[model samples]
Target: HSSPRLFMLSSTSSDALRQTARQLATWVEEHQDCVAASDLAYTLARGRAHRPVRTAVVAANLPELVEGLREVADGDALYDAAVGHGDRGPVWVFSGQGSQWAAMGTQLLASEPVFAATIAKLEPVIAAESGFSVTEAITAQQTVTGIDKVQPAVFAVQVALAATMEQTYGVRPGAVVGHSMGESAAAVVAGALSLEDAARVICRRSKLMTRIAGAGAMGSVELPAKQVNSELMARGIDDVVVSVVASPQSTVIGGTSDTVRDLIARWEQRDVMAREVAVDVASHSPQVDPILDDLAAALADIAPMTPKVPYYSATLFDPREQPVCDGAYWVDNLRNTVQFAAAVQAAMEDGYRVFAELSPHPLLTHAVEQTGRSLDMSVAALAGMRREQPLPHGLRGLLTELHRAGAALDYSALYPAGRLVDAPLPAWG
Candidate 1:
């Protein structure tokens, strides 16, 4: 806490590094010449993870140590002295609906301890609030079903997956972003809301969303937002709007059931890659108007705190202003366009290098990859869930992506060739 934020950086070793750095800084003041710079840098570098996507800094002196971490704090793939690679600064993106699968996270319940433990705890927390057994629903006889059951179940998986990522690998998000209802889980990941409060938000919001079920619809289309708007305007469709700006060329239109259905049919006739989402509520559209009041009221006093990690909102977004997901914020989230593409743009500009969709599917990550392509940034958007695969298989696949993208993982935790040797302390004696 005493060291400036500069030294208290991320990754699991960050806290330990902070403790070490404090003593080193004090020692440097009194015994600056006693410890050789090479010894210090070597010890610091080798003291933690041995490999990457990796890199290191050769601090010839204390000044270099300070400035080196300055660059480290900003996050770069190539630090001249970084051993093998460097982190691409990670961000966790949690998405809604598409992440739901028949039995997503089912096997994890039996095999993965961290995942199983998280799911076990979430079961009571979610069921207590929503009166739905999230864990059992995810492991349902024929996949999780219904809006109420599905949303909580998906939230349970996303949150548990995040926990597994952290507990097992020492990986934590540099920031967290949420797409649509996924923000509820993201809030929990970012330390904004407790499982108790987030359970309330996702469950209540989703159950209320069910009220308008079959009353409205949503459809994906090949057209860009501008083109979608042009079509809607030309047709005089009053309620339909560009609900999700997935990318410039990929978007979702939502509104009254008939209007959305008609749009999907029109696109289909043209052979466009258009399809209807299974969701019944017209999320991110005008039809959400009816559910707004209670949506706001139910979560009004839920007490959303300022998130520990930066939270980028897909709806009502401004990367500069992190929202406290309060009653009013939840209302804005539901009854507004999900400016997803813009949010990705904003995150890229703000220096987030990695985008990970920690869920059962990959919609938002694809959107991010497309955004990265358009923006001409070499983006690494990752997803690690497969319906037919064990969760850890996908998680290992994700670790490989992180490796290729230049992140230094705790390989020791995953397993490796040699026993890790301890870094020698020079001035402590």
Candidate 2:
């Protein structure tokens, strides 16, 4: 005397989904079978926004739903339990400047009205502050470089992608985390700072970086942070220090441009893999010391609010302390080593298993996952749109990936409230 179970189906196309919904509604409503047989498929198709992992039978005849049972079940992402089955929500990780690409925001600008409008709204603010157009920077034929142009342009795209994530895909962050300039964008999303202030902070901060542009450089080494002390000292490389623990194994080093490159070259000679980070200004090193006083003074009046969503900061080394992203905090953000792995560890210990980096590239996603492995825990790392994906397709693909990662999502985001349960099932014309 067990009750009937539900079998849900999903699809990427509305017509295929919609057709199944109407047709299935008829079979369940007219027959003696459990309502869920058709109702579940109906709701899944009609109620949820289309995801990349889609499946629809497209037939309602007696054998229609049964013939494809094997094919459908083989690929189903969700069954009866749709939301939150031993899964924590995702942390929206925003990437810093090096994540940018020439056409990062161009596809979204042309295809997504809201995303385009976000950049449009930000243009006046960024233009007044940075004196350049983000639209042009993101779409320009030349590759984006320079601290001023690269930083502000990357910030704009990350902010826009965050906006598009909420407005279009209905996926909201459980928490927010950011690295370097991306922290400004993350603060805006977390409601810790207004858009105008965050925009100004990035603009002014990167502007100061233009002062010492070519004097220093940064690079990543395959060695762990603790092990790098020996490498730098053994080589008698002065002025170089670990600026970021990018992951458990990949440590970021910076200071003295040519010395930095020479150390990397030395490591390479010993069969160690290392590469330079893409930037002229070396952040979190002595390279940034000259700008400290002016940077703090420029942002002294920068307002801060208690973040509306939980903000796990990558720069704030102490996890016990609540991060207040004020002007002083930003100055420290520029000068101090980015305890990135520590931040990811803290977030993981606090129950964030899924991380989605809001960037045109998957810069920090690998780091997050690697950090989790180092801590002997499992994590799912995801990314925003890549430079090559179409806008809508990229989003759907991301959502599908998140769903596969087991993070809960608003499946009913696209459908209007109040489904017609009592109305007669429609007959296809």
Candidate 3:
């Protein structure tokens, strides 16, 4: 805060390196000594690497530090630096239904007061809708095993986690995206809908889904969307529909229980990875079409405003086309294919380089990571919480990565009541 610090150079192309040189010209001129130049280059490089990795690199390369910095400055080489640069922070990708488990937020509730209070605030709304205490549900060993229970539980946890990230850790999202039931949480967090409205929507959605839970089933196919679609057509499997296009190699298909099971058996016979999703109802298929009108009526009174932050619609293919998150939008979101792959591609095309999956467990991080690498982009994908993992460990790792990627953070909020301690520096020969 006291002085100018060039965290990283901004670039849409190779010209960015040239711009970096131009910006550094004055600094290099002012500091004549190579030692000073080396310190400066390494300091900027540290902005791109993990903190521990940065320290290790500096210690290991002490002898060649001057020459390395000279080569980089003279345009002969480049160090481990991220390409795109800006203070704009990361994208929060909320996990959809199906990834939830019991005791998801238990650790955070005990260890993080900010997170606990957030859930407590929403407990009344959630309880009013479900006729059960959301806090007790989140803590119980048997909760989240049903759609009716998990929807509200996941939404409460996600909203609370979003609050913890911003209010406790000083991490604000540059954009927001979500999948299936997760979109309600994203809409609320993005300021498109009120928290109470989001709760009502999810509660109604879960009620509808629970009503039709036994009519159909869903399964995942380890094949591209095109391949799965082609096979469905060739085999005359008209009952099945590709519900989700998660990646080039993975798609989830939904249909009647018997038909879906047959398809899964066939895929496994061919040595292709396939499995039934843990759900009793088939979403994003004809099974949901009959419930659309009811869903619309349930959410008809809800109004959506333009989001405070950019929102990428997983139902839409392009980020440029804003989605009107009205009641009709919710209907389409349930009955149509989830174009998650397309939305992620659009985010990458729009220069979003960091993706953090806000969930109890990671479900789509691998898909996002694969999509970014396939597009030859440098992106960091992180999961907010993991199954059976400590919340602090997961949260700290995410914050560390976000900071190294040039995202500004208020570390004071991270340890609100704790004071900085002066420690002795490492000794060396």
Top model number, lDDT: 2
Cα lDDT of model 2 by residue, 1-429, tens digit: 132222344433434444554554455446525433444444553544434333334334434555454344344334321222324567888877767676777777876676788899889998999899889989887767878888888888888888877787677788888887778988999899998899989999988889887878899899998999787888787798998887889899989888888888888889998988767788888888998999999998899988888787877867435678889989998988887778788888887887889887878888998988888876778887776666644365666566656565565553323333332333322
Write one digit per residue (lDDT tens) for candidate 1, span 215-255.
78889998889988999899988888999887868999988
Candidate 2 matches the true fold with a TM-score of 0.80
Q: What's the alpha carbon RMSD for model 2?
A: 7.7
| Candidate 1: RMSD to truth | 11.1
Query: If both were scored by TM-score, which would come out higher, candidate 1 or candidate 3?
Result: 3
Candidate 3 stretches with Cα past 4 Å from truth are 1-86, 392-394, 405-429
Question: Model 3: which residue pairs collide?
Answer: none
lDDT score, residue 347, model 3? 79
Per-residue lDDT, model 2, residue 382, is 82
Model 1, stretches more than 4 Å misplaced?
1-85, 391-394, 408-429
Model 3, 141-246: lDDT tens digits are 8746677888899888888888878886688888888888888988888898888888988888888888888878899988999989999999988888999998
